[PDB]
Symmetry: C2
Subunit: 130 residues, 2 copies
Amino acid sequence: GALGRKLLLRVNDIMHTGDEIPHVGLQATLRDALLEITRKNLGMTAICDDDMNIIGIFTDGDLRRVFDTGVDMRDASIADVMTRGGIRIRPGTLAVDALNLMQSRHITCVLVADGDHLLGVVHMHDLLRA
Amino acid sequence: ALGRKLLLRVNDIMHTGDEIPHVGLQATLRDALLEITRKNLGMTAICDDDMNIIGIFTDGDLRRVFDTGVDMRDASIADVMTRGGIRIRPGTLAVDALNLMQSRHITCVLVADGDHLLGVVHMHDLLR
Ligand SMILES: Nc1ccn([C@@H]2O[C@H](COP(=O)(O)O[C@@]3(C(=O)O)C[C@@H](O)[C@@H](O)[C@@H]([C@H](O)CO)O3)[C@@H](O)[C@H]2O)c(=O)n1
Ligand SMILES: Nc1ccn([C@@H]2O[C@H](COP(=O)(O)O[C@@]3(C(=O)O)C[C@@H](O)[C@@H](O)[C@@H]([C@H](O)CO)O3)[C@@H](O)[C@H]2O)c(=O)n1
């Protein structure tokens, strides 16, 4: 009942915004990106330009995948290891459709955007709270 | 529909057998991450020869150890795993598994009888 009602909300009204958005710049180090991931507690970070347009994203899963090189990755830049672009939805998207997208793509956090402009982020956990 | 899927026991939806991610106590961190990738659930158990759970390791745990700045390439899983872990019984309802995952801030959970690993359920599994 409550979950069903929450899934009829627009993501605009449940997404993380402002300082709760994980994002770093294009010149960030991988360690910078990891700190941002840890602090914002969503398992991922965006990589944005100065206008808050999405350049890329990096998840905890991405770290596992890039770690599978023999070389020492500790001083890598984020620009070299990020996923370019990122899966996103419009702010009027219903939570149910965000869930369906996340299920079909096997991701747990989706960017909320107007074109390339990052407005917020929604995590699967957000769709089941409140 | 939503109400029915949420009322299933996790026994009926969990991954079992070869689909369970596990490595042994002597595995390397690289062995552990290979198993995580191969089984596609973002985590692995660490088990003894009787399939008893010693610990777990998740993609989040990799971030936490990597961000210590120590070179982790040659690490052993025994030195970086989380001992113990959160588990549920096979009769746990999907809705209760979801609430547990929410409360513990996790997206995948082991299904066990005591320490005996029976299966694993991902948040994705619960929401088909
Ligand atoms: N069945 C499980 C699953 C996980 N864990 C442990 O719970 C801690 C958190 O698990 P996580 O998967 O690493 O949790 C994260 C985290 O570690 O940051 C992942 C991250 O991508 C993001 O999803 C955040 C948000 O906090 C979600 O609320 O949550 C880890 O030490 C992990 O070993 C456990 O004991 N038993
Ligand atoms: N809004 C998003 C979110 C993620 N991604 C990209 O989609 C890929 C998958 O995201 P993930 O979070 O890394 O997905 C994982 C993965 O490793 O692919 C994480 C893992 O812990 C586990 O949750 C598995 C599922 O078990 C697979 O069903 O799913 C990554 O390259 C990520 O950059 C994206 O483009 N846009």
